[PDB]
Design an enzyme around this catalytic site. Structure first.
Site, mmCIF file in Angstrom:
data_model
loop_
_atom_site.group_PDB
_atom_site.id
_atom_site.type_symbol
_atom_site.label_atom_id
_atom_site.label_comp_id
_atom_site.label_asym_id
_atom_site.label_seq_id
_atom_site.Cartn_x
_atom_site.Cartn_y
_atom_site.Cartn_z
ATOM 1 N N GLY A 198 137.993 19.173 43.117
ATOM 2 C CA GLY A 198 136.694 19.819 43.071
ATOM 3 C C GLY A 198 136.875 21.292 42.751
ATOM 4 O O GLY A 198 137.942 21.704 42.288
ATOM 5 N N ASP A 250 127.153 27.233 39.690
ATOM 6 C CA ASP A 250 128.204 26.624 38.888
ATOM 7 C C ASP A 250 127.748 25.343 38.212
ATOM 8 O O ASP A 250 128.483 24.358 38.174
ATOM 9 C CB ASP A 250 129.466 26.368 39.718
ATOM 10 C CG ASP A 250 130.698 26.163 38.839
ATOM 11 O OD1 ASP A 250 130.703 26.680 37.704
ATOM 12 O OD2 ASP A 250 131.651 25.491 39.273
ATOM 13 N N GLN A 252 130.496 18.967 34.298
ATOM 14 C CA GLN A 252 131.500 18.445 35.227
ATOM 15 C C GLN A 252 130.973 18.315 36.670
ATOM 16 O O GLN A 252 131.458 17.490 37.436
ATOM 17 C CB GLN A 252 132.767 19.316 35.208
ATOM 18 C CG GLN A 252 133.586 19.263 33.918
ATOM 19 C CD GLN A 252 133.051 20.172 32.809
ATOM 20 O OE1 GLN A 252 132.060 20.887 32.984
ATOM 21 N NE2 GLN A 252 133.704 20.132 31.653
ATOM 22 N N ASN A 253 129.992 19.138 37.039
ATOM 23 C CA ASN A 253 129.450 19.125 38.402
ATOM 24 C C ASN A 253 128.146 18.344 38.504
ATOM 25 O O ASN A 253 127.441 18.409 39.520
ATOM 26 C CB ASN A 253 129.220 20.552 38.915
ATOM 27 C CG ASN A 253 130.514 21.284 39.199
ATOM 28 O OD1 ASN A 253 131.567 20.664 39.339
ATOM 29 N ND2 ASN A 253 130.441 22.604 39.296
ATOM 30 N N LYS A 260 127.420 22.931 35.487
ATOM 31 C CA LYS A 260 128.112 22.590 34.255
ATOM 32 C C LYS A 260 128.228 21.076 34.310
ATOM 33 O O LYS A 260 128.118 20.490 35.393
ATOM 34 C CB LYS A 260 129.497 23.249 34.208
ATOM 35 C CG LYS A 260 130.458 22.731 35.262
ATOM 36 C CD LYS A 260 131.699 23.593 35.379
ATOM 37 C CE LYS A 260 132.535 23.185 36.579
ATOM 38 N NZ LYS A 260 133.780 23.997 36.693
ATOM 39 N N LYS A 267 136.343 14.525 49.993
ATOM 40 C CA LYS A 267 136.887 15.799 49.568
ATOM 41 C C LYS A 267 137.775 16.322 50.690
ATOM 42 O O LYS A 267 137.289 16.674 51.767
ATOM 43 C CB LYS A 267 135.749 16.763 49.244
ATOM 44 C CG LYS A 267 136.152 18.054 48.556
ATOM 45 C CD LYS A 267 134.890 18.836 48.234
ATOM 46 C CE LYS A 267 135.177 20.129 47.521
ATOM 47 N NZ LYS A 267 133.922 20.767 47.049
ATOM 48 N N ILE A 283 140.386 10.849 42.506
ATOM 49 C CA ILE A 283 139.439 11.131 41.433
ATOM 50 C C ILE A 283 139.807 12.409 40.671
ATOM 51 O O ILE A 283 139.752 12.439 39.446
ATOM 52 C CB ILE A 283 138.001 11.271 41.982
ATOM 53 C CG1 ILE A 283 137.540 9.965 42.627
ATOM 54 C CG2 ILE A 283 137.037 11.680 40.877
ATOM 55 C CD1 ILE A 283 136.123 10.024 43.169
HETATM 56 C C1 LIG Z 1 133.569 18.491 40.357
HETATM 57 N N1 LIG Z 1 133.820 18.445 41.792
HETATM 58 C C2 LIG Z 1 133.453 17.286 42.517
HETATM 59 N N2 LIG Z 1 133.432 17.145 43.866
HETATM 60 C C3 LIG Z 1 133.041 15.948 44.341
HETATM 61 C C4 LIG Z 1 133.010 15.719 45.844
HETATM 62 C C5 LIG Z 1 132.707 14.979 43.359
HETATM 63 C C6 LIG Z 1 132.217 13.645 43.442
HETATM 64 N N3 LIG Z 1 132.679 12.700 42.587
HETATM 65 C C7 LIG Z 1 132.191 11.424 42.613
HETATM 66 N N4 LIG Z 1 132.730 10.420 41.696
HETATM 67 C C8 LIG Z 1 133.240 10.771 40.376
HETATM 68 C C9 LIG Z 1 133.132 12.079 39.877
HETATM 69 C C10 LIG Z 1 133.631 12.385 38.610
HETATM 70 C C11 LIG Z 1 134.251 11.372 37.819
HETATM 71 C C12 LIG Z 1 134.361 10.075 38.322
HETATM 72 N N5 LIG Z 1 135.001 9.021 37.511
HETATM 73 C C13 LIG Z 1 136.368 9.433 37.305
HETATM 74 C C14 LIG Z 1 137.394 8.436 37.706
HETATM 75 C C15 LIG Z 1 137.235 7.922 39.097
HETATM 76 N N6 LIG Z 1 136.273 6.877 39.194
HETATM 77 C C16 LIG Z 1 136.720 5.633 39.802
HETATM 78 C C17 LIG Z 1 135.763 4.469 39.938
HETATM 79 O O1 LIG Z 1 137.876 5.522 40.203
HETATM 80 C C18 LIG Z 1 134.909 6.901 38.753
HETATM 81 C C19 LIG Z 1 134.770 7.604 37.430
HETATM 82 C C20 LIG Z 1 133.856 9.770 39.590
HETATM 83 N N7 LIG Z 1 131.223 11.067 43.472
HETATM 84 C C21 LIG Z 1 130.697 11.985 44.340
HETATM 85 C C22 LIG Z 1 131.182 13.294 44.323
HETATM 86 C C23 LIG Z 1 130.603 14.277 45.244
HETATM 87 N N8 LIG Z 1 130.149 15.036 45.964
HETATM 88 S S1 LIG Z 1 132.948 15.769 41.849
#
Ligand SMILES: CNc1nc(C)c(-c2nc(Nc3cccc(N4CCCN(C(C)=O)CC4)c3)ncc2C#N)s1
EC number: 2.7.11.22
Lengths: 258, 299
Positions: free
Chosen positions: B14, B128, B132-133, B130, B34, B11
């Site tokens: 973080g 933090d 993005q989070n 924003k 993560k 993905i």
């Molecule tokens: C910013 N730091 C982060 N840490 C964690 C652990 C994150 C997290 N992310 C997700 N899913 C997610 C987050 C952001 C974007 C996406 N997109 C981007 C492409 C990948 N995607 C697929 C289906 O491949 C989905 C669309 C996905 N879920 C839970 C956490 C947590 N905690 S973000």
């Protein structure tokens, strides 16, 4: 008046019950004693002073140690390794600038290796299941302080000093919750410096009365009276400092008039 | 154990560590992993991981991403999180054409405030916030994520790390070097995010600290002792700061209605003490007709 102050107090009151060490663990530790523990905590106080760590960090470390020893039997030769790892974890959790691992290795006078200290860190985390955000005597004290009128440095410093003394002696202090020890400490400090008592407003906030604080207070008063003769003196030395308004030089009250 | 997870794809990163989408082979549950390598430490388990895990384990709320498990492999630490479909930043970018429907902006803000009030009630600062989070799912939920920079606070606060909050979302009291900051800094961030959801552009996109302060000043007016007692005594306040007039909020976020502007103005109050709490904001008239619709776009 910081918002959430009541929500937070209530939450800490819940959490302190869940973070409480087993009161009778020391009797179940075949190879370690209360005296060994006192020596360890007194040493951690020195470490804290040496590296100018927060008091909160000290309190957290002691909580981690007691919970660890509540579930893990430990040989005396490894007690200091447990304590060192605990202080490292507390520092990482609580400090803006925790000392580096090499510094923690160095303060054990090379009793343990960096490898050992790091493996113990991992073990401690596993044993505490990463639950490191424990309520401390310090956290309740800083809340209680908001109830002074007006605020008094001597009172605040003396309260912290007394609360800290309780860290050293598992018997009897393992039996009291942080909020109760903090209550006894705040009252005792207040009465010593100003003649005042546990205020009405803290009865409303905590549900504790002088009556319910009495048992812990009786203990703490005795601990206070005997502090100069205690085998462990690091806290007294620490609190001679102008930083803490030299409160360890104050004379304890002869009686409390409970 | 990692053996029950089939990885789907990477993905991104973080605040610390690397994030994967994965699938629990036995339950079917889709998760985010993560990975934090310990082999490059050296310093043991990173403080950022220790805080994230300890704090997130306590915070069970529908608008805070759920930490499901923590797995220690030979030289690795894996945090297993519930999977969400997208972050708010990408969602806003996708919404370049149509904009984001009011009911959705309102629902998201309402949810973010709930999540944040729960953090603050449990003595946690996020530090933090924003887009993005902030993560969204196909059902209309939005949730606070990435607690790598969070910390447990005390009452009253003491001095904490000064280098906090992504610049664009950083409160003036941090920019001015206040010795104390508290729950208000997260509210400031949410206010910037509220504005951003309406315009789909960052409210205060500075490229340095002084540039960031001046953008704030040029929008909300340069604070004085009247609007913010103590401001001229702050460690990084300078009497030479240009003195900009405050502009009507109707000009800061033109599409926003009277209720929305009212709420935004309270979230962006200069004085941390006057700035509205997440808890009090839940009862703001802006949310009188709030519902929880699904996102208008496929995620
Ligand atoms: C910013 N730091 C982060 N840490 C964690 C652990 C994150 C997290 N992310 C997700 N899913 C997610 C987050 C952001 C974007 C996406 N997109 C981007 C492409 C990948 N995607 C697929 C289906 O491949 C989905 C669309 C996905 N879920 C839970 C956490 C947590 N905690 S973000």
């Amino acid at each position: 008046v910081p918002d959430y102050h009541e929500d937070i107090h209530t939450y800490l009151r819940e959490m302190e019950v869940k973070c409480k060490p087993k009161v009778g663990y020391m009797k179940k530790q075949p190879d370690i004693t209360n005296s060994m523990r006192a020596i360890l905590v007194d040493w951690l106080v020195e470490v804290g002073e040496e590296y100018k760590l927060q008091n909160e960090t000290l309190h957290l470390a002691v909580n981690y140690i007691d919970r660890f020893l509540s579930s893990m039997s430990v040989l005396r030769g490894k007690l200091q390794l447990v304590g060192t790892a605990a202080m490292l974890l507390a520092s990482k959790f609580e400090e803006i600038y925790p000392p580096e691992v090499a510094e923690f290795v160095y303060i054990t006078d090379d009793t343990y290796t960096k490898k050992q200290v790091l493996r113990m860190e991992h073990l401690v985390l596993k044993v505490l299941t990463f639950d490191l955000a424990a309520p401390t005597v310090n956290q309740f004290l800083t809340q209680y302080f908001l109830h002074q009128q007006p605020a008094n440095c001597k009172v605040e410093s003396l309260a912290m000093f007394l609360g800290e003394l309780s860290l050293i002696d598992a018997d009897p202090y393992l039996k009291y919750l942080p909020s109760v020890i903090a209550a006894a400490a705040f009252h005792l400090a207040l009465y010593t410096v100003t003649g005042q008592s546990w205020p009405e407003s803290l009865i409303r906030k905590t549900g504790y009365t002088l009556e319910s604080l009495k048992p812990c207070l009786m203990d703490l008063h005795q601990t206070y009276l005997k502090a100069p003769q205690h085998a462990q003196q690091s806290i007294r030395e620490k609190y001679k400092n102008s930083k803490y308004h030299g409160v360890s030089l104050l004379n304890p009250p002869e009686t409390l008039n409970l | 154990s990692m053996e029950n997870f089939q990885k789907v794809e990477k993905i991104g990163e973080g605040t610390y560590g690397v994030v994967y989408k994965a699938r629990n082979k036995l339950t079917g549950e889709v998760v985010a992993l993560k990975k934090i390598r310990l082999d490059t430490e050296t310093e043991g388990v990173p403080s950022t991981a220790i805080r994230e895990i300890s704090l997130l384990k306590e915070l069970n709320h529908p608008n805070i991403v759920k930490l499901l498990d923590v797995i220690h492999t030979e030289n690795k630490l894996y945090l297993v999180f519930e999977f969400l479909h997208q972050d708010l930043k990408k969602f806003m970018d996708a919404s370049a054409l149509t904009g984001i429907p009011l009911p959705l902006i309102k629902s998201y803000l309402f949810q973010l405030l709930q999540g944040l009030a729960f953090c603050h009630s449990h003595r946690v600062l996020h530090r933090d916030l924003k887009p993005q989070n902030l993560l969204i799912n196909t059902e209309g939920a939005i949730k606070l994520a990435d607690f790598g920079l969070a910390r447990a606070f005390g009452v009253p606060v003491r001095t904490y790390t000064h280098e906090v909050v992504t610049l664009w979302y950083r409160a003036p009291e941090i920019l001015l070097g206040c010795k104390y900051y508290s729950t208000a800094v997260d509210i400031w961030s949410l206010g910037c995010i509220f504005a951003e959801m309406v315009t789909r552009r960052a409210l205060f996109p500075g490229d340095s600290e002084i540039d960031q302060l001046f953008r704030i000043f040029r929008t909300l007016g340069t604070p004085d002792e009247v609007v913010w007692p103590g401001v001229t005594s702050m460690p990084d306040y300078k009497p030479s700061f240009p003195k900009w007039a405050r502009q009507d909020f109707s000009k800061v976020v033109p599409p926003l209605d009277e209720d929305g502007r009212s709420l935004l103005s309270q979230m962006l109050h200069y004085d941390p003490n006057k700035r509205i709490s997440a808890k009090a904001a839940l009862a703001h008239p802006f949310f009188q007709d709030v519902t929880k619709p699904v996102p208008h776009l496929r995620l």
